[PDB]
Amino acid sequence: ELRVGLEESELWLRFKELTNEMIVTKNGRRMFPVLKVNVSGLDPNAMYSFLLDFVAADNHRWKYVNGEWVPGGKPEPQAPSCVYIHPDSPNFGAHWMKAPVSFSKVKLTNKLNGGGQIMLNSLHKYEPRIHIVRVGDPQRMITSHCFPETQFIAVTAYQNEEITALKIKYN
Numbered sequence: 001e002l003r004v005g006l007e008e009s010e011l012w013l014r015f016k017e018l019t020n021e022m023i024v025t026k027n028g029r030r031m032f033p034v035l036k037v038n039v040s041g042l043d044p045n046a047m048y049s050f051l052l053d054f055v056a057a058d059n060h061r062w063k064y065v066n067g068e069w070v071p072g073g074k075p076e077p078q079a080p081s082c083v084y085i086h087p088d089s090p091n092f093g094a095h096w097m098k099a100p101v102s103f104s105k106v107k108l109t110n111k112l113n114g115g116g117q118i119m120l121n122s123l124h125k126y127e128p129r130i131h132i133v134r135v136g137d138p139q140r141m142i143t144s145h146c147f148p149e150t151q152f153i154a155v156t157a158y159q160n161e162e163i164t165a166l167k168i169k170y171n
């Protein structure tokens with residue numbers, strides 16, 4: 001059976017405890033932690049592509065007030081659906097199962113200036129999601145997994161000084 005496990009889940013949870021934040025910039029910013037997953041139960045002989053997108057978590061915005069995150073207004077219109085294609089795609093099941101799959105090069109932006117980046121609205125919460133797409137399949141089978149440990153609020157600058165400190169501590 002197909003199993004996709006989050007790697008470094010305890011590191012993600014140290015960030016989620018504080019409410020995790022990821023910087024978005026005009027030119028794009030890599031994530032820390034990096035999203036990495038282990039995979040078993042693909043057909044080692046078949047070929048798949050791996051995709052990453054970011055699902056909006058709430059029907060409202062957030063704001064950091066008196067040291068706490070609280071509901072911060074109505075949401076901005078949905079960011080356009082951008083998908084990040086894992087650079088190893090397409091590849092054999094055996095390739096994806098050989099070692100954890102890392103999305104270390106994805107960049108998050110708040111400006112649609114292209115470059116295979118993901119556009120996010122500042123002060124909104126997102127949950128990373130991975131899709132596995134079978135190659136050459138007339139049914140276009142796709143399997144999708146969410147990772148609740150990895151939820152974060154997109155920000156143009158860190159709000160929580162503890163997040164700023166944790167980002168330096170572990171990176």
Ligand SMILES: CC(=O)Nc1ccc(-c2csc(N3CCOCC3)n2)cc1
Binds near residue numbers: 051083085089140141
């Ligand atoms: C059942 C069903 O809805 N299937 C399905 C839906 C969406 C995709 C999809 C979305 S972007 C994509 N790419 C991007 C280019 O490289 C790999 C393929 N594939 C694939 C299959």
